[PDB]
Amino acid sequence: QYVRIKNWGSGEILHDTLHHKATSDFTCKSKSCLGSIMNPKSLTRGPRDKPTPLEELLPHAIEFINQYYGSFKEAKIEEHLARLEAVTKEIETTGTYQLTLDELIFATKMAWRNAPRCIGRIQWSNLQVFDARNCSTAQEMFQHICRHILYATNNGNIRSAITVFPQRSDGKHDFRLWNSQLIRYAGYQMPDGTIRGDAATLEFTQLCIDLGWKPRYGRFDVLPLVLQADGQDPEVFEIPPDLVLEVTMEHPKYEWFQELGLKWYALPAVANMLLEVGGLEFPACPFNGWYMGTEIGVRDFCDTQRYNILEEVGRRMGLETHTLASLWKDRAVTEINVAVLHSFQKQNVTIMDHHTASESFMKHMQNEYRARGGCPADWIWLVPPVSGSITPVFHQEMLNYVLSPFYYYQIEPWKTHIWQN
Amino acid sequence: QYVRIKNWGSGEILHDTLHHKATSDFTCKSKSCLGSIMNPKSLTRGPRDKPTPLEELLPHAIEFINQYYGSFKEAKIEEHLARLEAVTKEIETTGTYQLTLDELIFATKMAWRNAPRCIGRIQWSNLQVFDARNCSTAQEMFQHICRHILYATNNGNIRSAITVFPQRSDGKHDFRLWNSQLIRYAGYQMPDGTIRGDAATLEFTQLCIDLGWKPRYGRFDVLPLVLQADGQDPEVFEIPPDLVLEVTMEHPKYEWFQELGLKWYALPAVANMLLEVGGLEFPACPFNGWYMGTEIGVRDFCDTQRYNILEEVGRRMGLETHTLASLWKDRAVTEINVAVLHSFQKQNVTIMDHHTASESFMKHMQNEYRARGGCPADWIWLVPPVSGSITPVFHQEMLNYVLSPFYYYQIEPWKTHIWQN
Ligand code: HEM
Ligand code: HEM
Ligand SMILES: COc1ccnc(NC2CCN(C(=O)c3ccc(C#N)cc3)CC2)c1
Ligand SMILES: COc1ccnc(NC2CCN(C(=O)c3ccc(C#N)cc3)CC2)c1
Ligand SMILES: C[C@H](O)[C@H](O)[C@@H]1CNc2nc(N)[nH]c(=O)c2N1
Ligand SMILES: C[C@H](O)[C@H](O)[C@@H]1CNc2nc(N)[nH]c(=O)c2N1
């Protein structure tokens, strides 16, 4: 009736029942675990070419409506009944249905709340929702996206927000943001063979170039928004530079750190995921919260296939960068992490260290178990890329399952898209 | 026909087919992952009260014999046939069978090779095997265990070894080491309420005390061996102090580190696991390799429920131990890790840093895929407790499955044991 879960730091035990509401089969098999796979099909919601079979839709819609009304302090059965009926009718007369703004808001929060890989979920109920289900052109998308960036950035005082574009109709008119994230730096393969900027965006950068974007060949060139509306070919749009807030990296003691000429954007916005709710699918709905220091200090700046600055920082610290056992990498990466936090702080930009975030999640997870007997969590993603066991999340056993509403991954658009011309 | 696996640092792809040889259902379900569970039933091989049904044994024995002979450079079908027959007959006439020493050696290495949670597997073929399947008394066990400790310790030049005691017969005469590891420090709850030594061994310490062991109330009291032979009640045995090599912790710059009065044993020996091979089960077979710095520097010294020295080291470094975001914990734990490595090195004791170990495993995993198209690996256990993404293993997708031979966990003996008197 419940899965037993234990925290080996406190010895605390928790009983998980929420996993019963899980959906289709997860990642792992019966006699094999694929937990460390980044993009398993179980987390991907692909494209369709026909509407959702009414036999499948109705039940899901009924479930969501019940979940929605069941979330109120004081019930409202009459409204609940009426809503259940209005939806059934709309589905019969239109072959689909529309969510009320409140329903939409409710769904975006629950989906966030149901994100196994998100460590900032204690903030789940604090989300600004921008309703753009009325959008129809690429240009309109772009304006909505700019309004989102501006609202969220808030001149350093970051605010969590999400923009919901039109829901998938027949799957032939999907609104899609071809970008992985709203703000991201370009990556160029230079003439001399070296790579400039973020090597991670090499292909995508080229794609923008192929679509008429002008390469500026810098180390931190903010890529353009590639927008696809109503299923039409994607159009390119440069982001107004004024909208992109950046932080210059400075160390609180090493004056030579700024000599590294590094910086990073302040807005962490996921741009390519799909919001699934009550049978409906929103192929385009960018959302953001605020950065956790390690993403920049460790992944962006230290992954070898990214900006890869670890060795450089090593030498400038006078460490034995030629002997692994000297643990110079451990010393280097920490100073870098200290630089990131120090910088966002000095420039008054919202950011969170991984220690504080982990404790935050632990409190959240505990709240969730009391509140609903479960919290889908992916240990592999929740444990920071540094200081693993130093954080409490590391000693917490977790259960990973897919509920609904949910934020799914999607097949890269350029691999399934049918160009007009 | 194969599971696709990718390394996001090199972009390299690997095809896993070895997982086809997997056994019963693994940890995770169909629509739920329990990868972060420490002791799932899928990894535990419990007690029996009756022999292994011949219908189950024979097939397994046949498989192992085939695997064994199939591992030679130049085949030897005649011997292979003869062996297949001799085993079948032995099973029919005795209801079980005995492995040849070479078979046993082969099995202990493969089992090691098949350990998903072991990062030092590149050393798999380098293992000293002590055949104690002739043992019969607790006293004899103890002598074998002492010989193992002495051989493995080798005065600092650690050598990997395993001691195999009698295989389970009817499950009523199991040889069992009640200890989790051969060398481990006692933990005492003092009169004033504080805890002295290793809080992790509080219960077990009490159990030894209840069995007639004398508590020395020190911070580093090596617990006694609790041995169970031929299924009889466990007998206590103090380990000859001369056999336990220890390292005094010293920092290469902070002279006040030795003032912490810390030390740790040099021998990392797993004492409570069961070796499964060709249908046979060896409930007692301690084994060891050599330490990886982080186990001591991070888990033993920094886990809050263990020696918990992090804050202390923090203050002595003059860090802002009152502000998490200052990342003092990241700075403290690294100096501690540096202390551990520096100390084992100065005292000429074999030890490995986590960076070097990770690269070692990456090479191994690569070898394994070429050699046999797979390598069971548990990402959650293979990624060090610090410097996660700084190590290559972190960016490597992995498949976790149970093959055979295998090293299983067992139910704690004191929970299923039937005392004589
Ligand atoms: C308020 C502050 C927030 C913090 C500090 C936080 C932090 C994080 C971090 C560190 C990650 C890891 C990203 C990676 O490794 O690629 C993440 C992932 C994620 N977050 Fe949050 N988050 C916040 C808000 C949000 C919001 C507002 C939503 C949605 C409405 C959300 C949805 C997700 C999802 C779905 C993922 C998974 C991304 C993926 O699968 O690539 N987060 N978050
Ligand atoms: C030669 C050096 C070796 C190194 C550096 C190495 C390192 C490690 C490390 C760091 C762990 C993690 C332990 C924990 O977190 O509790 C581990 C686990 C393990 N090792 Fe190795 N190992 C070595 C040799 C061996 C040998 C000789 C065997 C067996 C014959 C072995 C079997 C295992 C098993 C089964 C585990 C899992 C333990 C558990 O589930 O609690 N290792 N090893
Ligand atoms: C939704 O709320 C939050 C809150 C805090 N962090 C995130 N992380 C996201 C992932 C990291 N992000 C990137 O842009 C990125 C992603 C990948 C690579 C590479 N290879 C390089 C950079 C910002 C968005 C989301
Ligand atoms: C087989 O080969 C190797 C090679 C390198 N490391 C290991 N690790 C093992 C686990 C760590 N070990 C402990 O004794 C221990 C275990 C648990 C706790 C606690 N709570 C405290 C201490 C040494 C054995 C095995
Ligand atoms: C292979 C590994 O699955 C992927 O490298 C990991 C682990 N955890 C992560 N955790 C977060 N939060 N973000 C990540 O990219 C990854 N990737
Ligand atoms: C909950 C978590 O499953 C357990 O804390 C973890 C993760 N990985 C580990 N990895 C190793 N190598 N040893 C461990 O004890 C643990 N425990």
Annotate B157-173 with DSSP letters as a single string.
Answer: S---EEEE-PPPSSSSS
List the A176-177 sheet strands across, edge first: A176-177, A225-228, A235-237
Q: Which residue of B has its CA nearest to A252?
A: B326
Q: Which of A330, A335, A393 is most worth mutating to test chain B (most B CB atoms within 10 A of its CB)?
A: A330
Determine whether B73 is exposed, middle or buried from the number of CB atoms within 10 Å of its CB (0-12, 13-18, 19+).
Answer: exposed
DSSP B55-122: HHHHHHHHHHHHHHHTTSSS--HHHHHHHHHHHHHHHHHHSS----HHHHHHHHHHHHHT-TT-TTGG
A181 annotated to a ligand binding site: yes
Is residue A204 within 8 A of residue A180, CB to CB? The reply is yes
Rounded Cα–Cα distance for residues A353 and B331 (Å)? 14
The arrangement of secondary structure in B134-159+174-245+409-413, i.e. its CATH architecture, is Alpha-Beta Complex (3.90)
Is B73 in CB contact (< 8 Å) with chain A? no
- Give CA separation, A13 vs A4, A8, A349, B271, in Å: 7, 9, 38, 26
User: What is the number of the ligand closest to the CA of A108?
Assistant: 1
User: Are the folds of B11-133+160-170+274-288+358-382 and B134-159+174-245+409-413 the same?
Assistant: no
Nearest partner of B244 among B218, B263, B228, B216, judged by Cα = B263
Rounded to 5°, the CA angle A256-A261-A264 comes to: 120
Q: Which amino acid is at B54?
A: L
Facing residues of A44 across strands? A409
Put simply, the answer to whether B23 touches A34 (Cβ < 8 Å) is no
Nearest partner of B377 among B405, B396, B353, B355, judged by Cα = B396
Rounded Cα–Cα distance for residues B330 and A337 (Å)? 10
Is residue A131 within 8 A of residue A104, CB to CB? The reply is yes
CATH for the B246-268+291-356 domain, from 3.60.20.10, 3.90.1150.10, 3.90.1230.10, 3.40.50.300? 3.90.1230.10
Query: How far does the centroid of ligand 1 lie from the alpha carbon of residue A269, in Å?
Result: 9
Rounded Cα–Cα distance for residues B5 and B223 (Å)? 43
Query: How far does the centroid of ligand 1 lie from the alpha carbon of residue B364, in Å?
Result: 34
Distance (Å) from the alpha carbon of B30 to chain A's nearest alpha carbon: 5
Is residue A208 within 8 A of residue A214, CB to CB? The reply is no
Query: On the CB side of B51, how many CA atoms lie within 13 Å of its CA?
Result: 11
A409 annotated to a ligand binding site: yes
* B325 Cβ contact list (under 8 Å, min separation 6): A341, A353, A355, A356
Q: Which amino acid is at B42?
A: S
Q: Which residue among B31, B36, B37 sits closest to A25, beta carbon to beta carbon? A: B31
Facing residues of A161 across strands? A128, A288
Residue A48, number of CB atoms within 10 A of its CB: 15
For residue A201 the two structure tokens come to 């965006």
For residue A198 the two structure tokens come to 């973020």
Put simply, the answer to whether A386 touches B389 (Cβ < 8 Å) is yes
Identify the DSSP state of B132: -
Report strand pairing: A128-131 vs A161-164: parallel
Is A349 in CB contact (< 8 Å) with chain B? no
Put simply, the answer to whether B35 touches A30 (Cβ < 8 Å) is no
Rounded Cα–Cα distance for residues B278 and B57 (Å)? 7
Map out the domains of chain B as residue ranges: 11-133+160-170+274-288+358-382, 134-159+174-245+409-413, 246-268+291-356
User: What is the number of the ligand closest to the CA of B160?
Assistant: 2
Q: Tell the residue number behind the tokens 């060090």, with chain if given.
A: B384
Residue A92, number of CB atoms within 10 A of its CB: 11
Is residue B217 within 8 A of residue B196, CB to CB? The reply is yes
For residue A246 the two structure tokens come to 């950046």
Report strand pairing: A13-16 vs A3-6: antiparallel
Rounded Cα–Cα distance for residues B260 and B340 (Å)? 13
Window 361-400 of B, Cβ < 8 Å to A: 378-380, 383-390, 394-400
CB pairs under 8 A between A and B: 200
For ligand 1, whether the C-beta of A220 sits within 6 Å is: no
For the four alpha carbons of B179, B181, B186 and B188, in that order, the dihedral sign comes to negative
A48 annotated to a ligand binding site: no
Q: Which residue among B19, B338, B389 sits closest to A298, beta carbon to beta carbon? A: B389
CATH 3.90.340.10 fits B11-133+160-170+274-288+358-382, yes or no: yes
Is A21 in CB contact (< 8 Å) with chain B? no
* B271 Cβ contact list (under 8 Å, min separation 6): B177, B179, B180, B181, B182, B286
Rounded Cα–Cα distance for residues B156 and B373 (Å)? 36
Is A334 in CB contact (< 8 Å) with chain B? yes
Q: Which residue among B31, B37, B329 sits closest to A26, beta carbon to beta carbon? A: B31
Q: Tell the residue number behind the tokens 């691999």, with chain if given.
A: A415
Query: On the CB side of B159, how many CA atoms lie within 13 Å of its CA?
Result: 17
A299 annotated to a ligand binding site: yes
Distance (Å) from the alpha carbon of B230 to chain A's nearest alpha carbon: 33
Rounded Cα–Cα distance for residues B108 and B117 (Å)? 16
* A157 Cβ contact list (under 8 Å, min separation 6): A348, A350
Rounded Cα–Cα distance for residues A187 and A195 (Å)? 7
